[PDB]
Amino acid sequence: EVPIPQSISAEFKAALAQYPTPSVEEARSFVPTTAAQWRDYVQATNKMQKTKIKNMRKHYGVTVELLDIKGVTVRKITPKSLSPEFKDHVYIDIHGGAYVLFAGLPSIEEGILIAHRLGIVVYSVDYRMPPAYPFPAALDDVKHVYRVLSQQYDANHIFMGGTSAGGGLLLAFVQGLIENGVATPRAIYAGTPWADLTKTGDSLYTNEGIDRILITYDGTLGASARLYAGNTPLTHPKLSPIYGDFTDFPPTFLVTGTRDMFLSDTVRVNRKMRDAGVTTVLDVYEGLSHADYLVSHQTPESQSVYRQLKRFLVGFT
């Protein structure tokens, strides 16, 4: 069949060995259909994640300050020391979770890694999600936070980033800034972005059962897309920003992996950006699934992701 990737770090090999190869069958059949089933999936998953966040916060020694910005919950994450290159810049993090998971403290996982590994202050947006708040609630929240932080720091001193759903939301958001004539962030990061909610990217098929994190589109992933979308067609560019326009995008850093089910959508975004004359850096990791650099963040591969992101953003300071 398929061995653990032989050329990856021994640390990452150990990480992969410790999860059983989960079941495509069991992932496909897991689909909430009632309000109580969605609520409990979300609440139980978030409770599990909150413990990880507490440990990470203590480990890296970051401060986490709970704010309200124009009615949006935001957590400001400050590392023990800051990189001099990022003086007077800040980073706005848009978390992932397939548009249904990781509200509250669980939202700040990547935000902690960014703050600590880049040495930059991070504002992680705790945006609204279905079932209660489907599209466009999350987009409205990001807009309202950016309007405040852009006035306080200047657009050209703001970096933004997000993984997975947060990456897709970010692309949709920047598309909206551009079509409304509003100044964009200096540079952005999209980690394995959910750039198309439909089952269109080839790797959704070919890395089914290979991506150890997403596993398949056909269970909660597609169902989470439909819940977020409501009666909006899934090809609407603010749901699926691959279908929007990338003209005038700020320089973008895109991360994915050879086993990632969102490999295709990440490279589709890269291609459409380059065709629009956008500056991009694509960084694809051997052997890596969707967001593996988050899931297994104490690996050389994870360190590499944030090292290369730092080098990229430093270039625009």
Chain residues binding a second copy by CB under 8 A are 1-3, 5-7, 200-203, 205-208, 210, 258-259, 263-264, 267-268, 270-271, 274-275, 282-287, 304, 308
In the sheet that 187-191 helps form, which strands lie side by side, from edge to edge?
63-69, 72-78, 122-126, 90-94, 158-163, 187-191, 252-257, 280-285
Asked if residue 164 binds Cl ion (CB under 5 A), the reply is yes
**Which partner from the list Cl ion, a second copy, none does 309 bind, CB cut-off 5 to 8 Å by kind?**
none
Segment interacting with Cl ion, rule: CB under 5 A, options 46-54, 58-66, 278-286, 298-306:
278-286
- How far is it, in rounded angstroms, from Cα 111 to Cα 216? 26
- How far is it, in rounded angstroms, from Cα 100 to Cα 131? 8
Nearest Cα residue to 161 out of 300, 52, 294: 294
Q: Residue 316 in 3-state DSSP?
A: coil
* Smallest distance, a second copy to C-beta of residue 59, A: 25
Tokens for 77, please give them. Answer: 């994450």
- How far is it, in rounded angstroms, from Cα 111 to Cα 166? 12
Asked if residue 96 binds Cl ion (CB under 5 A), the reply is yes
Asked if residue 220 binds Cl ion (CB under 5 A), the reply is no
* Smallest distance, Cl ion to C-beta of residue 214, A: 8
Closer residue to a second copy in complex, CB, 150/266: 266
Segment interacting with Cl ion, rule: CB under 5 A, options 91-99, 116-124, 179-187, 239-247:
91-99
Asked if residue 281 binds Cl ion (CB under 5 A), the reply is yes
Among 98, 122, 195, 239, binds Cl ion (CB under 5 A): 98
* Smallest distance, a second copy to C-beta of residue 280, A: 9
* Smallest distance, a second copy to C-beta of residue 35, A: 32
Contacts of 63 (CB under 8 A, 6+ apart): 76, 77, 78
Among 278, 282, 295, 314, binds Cl ion (CB under 5 A): 282
Q: Which helix (H) or strand (E) holds 45?
A: helix 35-60
- How far is it, in rounded angstroms, from Cα 309 to Cα 317? 13
DSSP count for the chain of H helices, then E strands: 11, 8
Query: Interface with Cl ion by CB under 5 A: which residues?
Result: 96, 98, 164-165, 281-282
